[PDB]
Amino acid sequence: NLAPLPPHVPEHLVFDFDMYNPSNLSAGVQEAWAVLQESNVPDLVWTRCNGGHWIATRGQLIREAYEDYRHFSSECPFIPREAGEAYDFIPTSMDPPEQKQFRALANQVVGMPVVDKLENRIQELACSLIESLRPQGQCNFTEDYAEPFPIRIFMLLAGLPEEDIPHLKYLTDQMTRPDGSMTFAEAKEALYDYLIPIIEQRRQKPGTDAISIVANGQVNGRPITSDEAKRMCGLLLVGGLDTVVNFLSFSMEFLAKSPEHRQELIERPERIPAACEELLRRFSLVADGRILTSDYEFHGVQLKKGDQILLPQMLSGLDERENACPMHVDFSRQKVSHTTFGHGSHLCLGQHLARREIIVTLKEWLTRIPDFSIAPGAQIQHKSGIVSGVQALPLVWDPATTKAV
Ligand code: HEM
Ligand SMILES: CC1(C)[C@@H]2CC[C@@]1(C)C(=O)C2
């Protein structure tokens, strides 16, 4: 389903890429998106899929656009337009200077100091989950670890019941990797139907949880409104439930296929942080965008007001002009360049929490289960969207080779 080409788009700039179903998906999602960086593809293209929109394919252009909020607004960040229009999360749907005040409050609940305080809990949960899995000699990583580990930590931070995970996770996924079962607007309404009663309660009887903090926070000198708190908590929910969850699976899938990389981290632990950065570059998984606030000539191409442009955060680090041999994983890269956590005024506030969860996982898993691989005959399938992911990851290992710690 290709939308008719708009009058202002030159035919030679057309490249019909479908971000929800790219062609080479079987080869891996990152590989599928990397076709946009082939020599035959211009730096800025227009796709007729998903309603029609531009796509910047180079790190330089992606960074530039994310810095210039004057022309590229966060008001409509999701594609298709219907989704971008229904999108109202704070502070991501706001441009500076308005965004700043809300960003400050959100930093209060997921910023560095909160991570420092939750450190021991993150460590305890990781160890507890792995030790319970260790003797079994097999598991579906996505559902046995990738999902429970980060999600339970978030539910703990937000003060929400574990029983609600299945429901909340389903809604979140519909927003990033649309099933077709429901529209973004409907998925958003349901999520808000869930939060409203809770925020109402936390406003009267405040706790120490993230939601209580947001609900009773202050912005621009005055108290936050119920609606504003709702829209911010909505964003925190999606970030906590559908980001680290998918990244862990991409990383573990790679480690399961590369004994040499596992060994490297086991023998030289001081390399884990650097390894984490390189994995974040190679397995980058986010791609959202901006909307043109007016007509603007960008690198020779004429963009029209209202035009939507996808600026794939995942593509910056795969760009060869930024990283030599981009598809190759090299823990000793002198320079790891990427925009996995974003760029510009909307730089990810939860990146400290994410890095902590990734590093703890790598260390604690390789400590107890140094040797593992993908189950024979299993075919790992990736899924594309605003946030990419892995369908399932069956792993197997010899319990005799594990170490109880
Ligand atoms: C590895 C996982 C993660 C990745 C790759 C990631 C990526 C991103 C990206 C690319 C943005 C910018 C979006 C844009 O500019 O339109 C962003 C924003 C944000 N992320 Fe993360 N994120 C991750 C984990 C988290 C977590 C765990 C949370 C916490 C619940 C979270 C909270 C936020 C917030 C609050 C923003 C909005 C900041 C603002 O608009 O000022 N993220 N993230
Ligand atoms: C693009 C994101 C990864 C970022 C945090 C959750 C997300 C889906 C948003 O809507 C903003």
* Residue 177 among the catalytic residues: yes
Closest ligand to the CA of 93: 1
- Please give the distance, rounded to the nearest whole angstrom, from the Cα atom of residue 342 to the centre of ligand 1: 7
Q: State the number of CA atoms in the 13 A half-sphere of 112 facing the CB.
A: 0
**Angle of the 244-257 helix axis to the 259-267 helix axis, nearest 10:** 100
C-alpha span between 100 and 344 (Å, rounded) = 12
Backbone angles phi, psi at 320, to 5 degrees: -60, -30
Say if strands 308-311 and 301-303 run parallel, antiparallel, or are unpaired: unpaired
3-state secondary structure at position 222: strand
Residue 226 near residue 200, CB atoms below 8 Å? yes
The catalytic position among 173, 209, 242, 288 is: 242
Rg (CA), the chain: 21
Resolution in units of Å: 2.0
For 58, 90, 143, the CA distances from 282, given in Å and listed in that order, are 15, 29, 23
Query: Does the Cβ of 349 fall within 6 Å of ligand 2?
Result: no
C-alpha span between 215 and 225 (Å, rounded) = 8
Q: Which domain holds residue 286?
A: 1-405
Most ligand 1 atoms within 8 A of CB, residue of 169, 311, 348 to mutate: 348
Q: Where are the beta strands (DSSP E) in 225-376?
A: 288-292, 296-298, 301-303, 308-311, 373-374
Report DSSP letters for 21-33, one per residue.
S-TTGGG-HHHHH
Q: Residue 396, exposed/middle/buried by CB under 10 A (0-12, 13-18, 19+)?
A: middle
3-state secondary structure at position 72: strand
What experimental approach yielded this model?
Answer: X-ray
- Residue 193 has a CB neighbour count (10 Å cut-off) of 10
- CATH assignment at residue 405: 1.10.630.10
* Residue whose tokens read 């823990």: 331
* Residue 243 among the catalytic residues: yes
Tokens representing residue 348 in the block: 């990810």
Q: How many domains does the chain have?
A: 1
> Which residue has its alpha carbon closest to ligand 2 atom 2?
239
C-alpha span between 17 and 220 (Å, rounded) = 42
What's the gap between Cα 49 and its chain centre? 22
**Which is nearest to 236 in space by CA: 102, 359, 141, 146?**
102
Amino acid at 161: P
